[PDB]
Amino acid sequence: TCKITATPSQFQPALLNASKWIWTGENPIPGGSNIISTRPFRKNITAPCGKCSVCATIVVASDDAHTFYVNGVRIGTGAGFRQGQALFVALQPTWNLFAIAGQNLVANSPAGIMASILVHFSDGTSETFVTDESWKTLRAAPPENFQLPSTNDSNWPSAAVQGAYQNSVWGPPVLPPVLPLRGSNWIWTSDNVNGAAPVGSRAFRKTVNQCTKVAVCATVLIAADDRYTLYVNGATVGSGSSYTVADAYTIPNLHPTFNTFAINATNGGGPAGVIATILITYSDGSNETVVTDASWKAIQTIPQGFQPPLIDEFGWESAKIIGAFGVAPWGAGMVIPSA
């Protein structure tokens, strides 16, 4: 219902610094011993002002495990307090019901859930929402359909705070990478032969087109040896020149059904490659991941308009897999921005 005037930008990490650990308060000592149990947590969050909410980056950690729901839909499952888990989800424009089922799995041990929800709005702004005492819970196993908006949480008690980011039994969870490179492939043109490749620029193209769904936001993690410039639906998103520090980008104004990612990557000499991971969120709560692989198309001499969405791909080849993320010479040490 709002015009999206947000444009592609550098990825903005959701942080855990303002967030709180929550549980039920069955033990009034925070951080105290709790029984083996499963417990529900809910929060209805509304968009401010004359702002529409579009999508969200979530970071969630638990002692011991969780399941995360948005507007009734399961988005993810995770565990552990040492490191957060990254989730991405499209949102309803004016309100969104977040719900989490947490489990304590060890007897007499502490229990708790911590999250941060960075909501991106139509106008290009953002706000972080956190787990805290304003969430609702129950001192009992979650009812059938606790996560659906149609459940009335009006008589539920308030959640009890177990600790804060810096001051808790858990200590501060480490942020995960925004997206994994494990799972992707360094690619190039066919050109790249014995730890190769020649000195040109080369172009790569991937199209995603699920005509029965509505695509909302994309997040892109990318790096290249040496340098790249990245385009989505013909517009310039960004560029880089490091094969040891990756760049991440947010595309909040995706086309609903058809989107094209294109890269001009340049080899200055020696080995060469481009690697990327892309996550696209859909309005029904589902998502998809695309990675650099052989489904991408590539070409040795870059034509005018290589970046437009609808060009003829005749005489582009299947991109060559140089190797899975990890291979020499680049190794596994890429610095990846935090979620």
Ligand X SMILES: *[C@@H]1O[C@H](CO)[C@@H](O[C@@H]2O[C@H](CO)[C@@H](O)[C@H](O)[C@H]2NC(C)=O)[C@H](O)[C@H]1NC(C)=O
* CA–CA separation, 279 and 264 (whole Å): 20
Q: Is residue 46 a contact residue for ligand X (CB under 6 A)?
A: yes
Q: Is residue 11 a contact residue for ligand X (CB under 6 A)?
A: no
Spacing of C-alpha 103 from chain mean position: 24
Integer Rg of the chain from CA: 22
Q: Is residue 184 a contact residue for ligand X (CB under 6 A)?
A: no
Residue 12 interacting partner from Ca ion, ligand X, none (CB closer than 5 to 8 Å by kind): none
Q: Is residue 265 a contact residue for Ca ion (CB under 5 A)?
A: no
* CA–CA separation, 269 and 276 (whole Å): 21
Q: Is residue 192 a contact residue for ligand X (CB under 6 A)?
A: no
Scored b (16 or more CB within 10 A) or e, 15-24 reads bbeebbbbbb
Spacing of C-alpha 226 from chain mean position: 26
| CA distances to 107, 244, 258 from 235, in Å | 55, 25, 14
Residues 110-139 that bind Ca ion (CB under 5 A): 111
Binding site as annotated, residues: 63-64, 104, 109-110, 225-226, 267, 269, 271
Q: Is residue 104 a contact residue for Ca ion (CB under 5 A)?
A: yes
Q: Which of 88, 165, 186, 188 binds ligand X (CB under 6 A)?
A: 88
Residue 201 interacting partner from ligand X, Ca ion, none (CB closer than 5 to 8 Å by kind): ligand X
Window of 22-30, 86-94, 110-118, 292-300 that interacts with ligand X by CB under 6 A: 86-94
Residues touching ligand X, count (CB under 6 A): 19
Contact criterion met (CB below 8 Å) for 319 and 275: no
Q: What is the smallest separation between the CB atom of 306 and ligand X, expressed in angstroms?
A: 6
Q: Which of 44, 109, 190, 241 binds Ca ion (CB under 5 A)?
A: 109
Residue 64 interacting partner from ligand X, Ca ion, none (CB closer than 5 to 8 Å by kind): Ca ion
Q: Is residue 147 a contact residue for ligand X (CB under 6 A)?
A: no
5: exposed, middle or buried (Cβ count in 10 Å: 0-12, 13-18, 19+): exposed
Q: Is residue 220 a contact residue for ligand X (CB under 6 A)?
A: no
Q: Is residue 263 a contact residue for Ca ion (CB under 5 A)?
A: no
Q: Which is nearer to ligand X, 195 or 268 (CB)?
A: 268
Q: Which of 5, 7, 94, 145 binds ligand X (CB under 6 A)?
A: 94
Q: Which of 18, 35, 106, 140 binds Ca ion (CB under 5 A)?
A: 106
Residues 6+ apart with CB under 8 A from 244: 223, 330, 333, 334, 335
Residues 6+ apart with CB under 8 A from 28: 160
Residue 72's nearest CA partner among 102, 58, 53, 92 is 92
DSSP E strands, 153-257: 160-164, 185-188, 201-209, 215-225, 228-232, 235-240, 247-251
Contact criterion met (CB below 8 Å) for 116 and 130: yes
Q: Is residue 272 a contact residue for Ca ion (CB under 5 A)?
A: yes
Q: Which of 64, 123, 293, 317 binds Ca ion (CB under 5 A)?
A: 64
Q: Is residue 189 a contact residue for ligand X (CB under 6 A)?
A: no
Q: What are the residues binding ligand X (CB under 6 A)?
A: 44, 46, 75-77, 87-89, 94-95, 97, 149, 201, 229, 264, 266, 286-287, 302
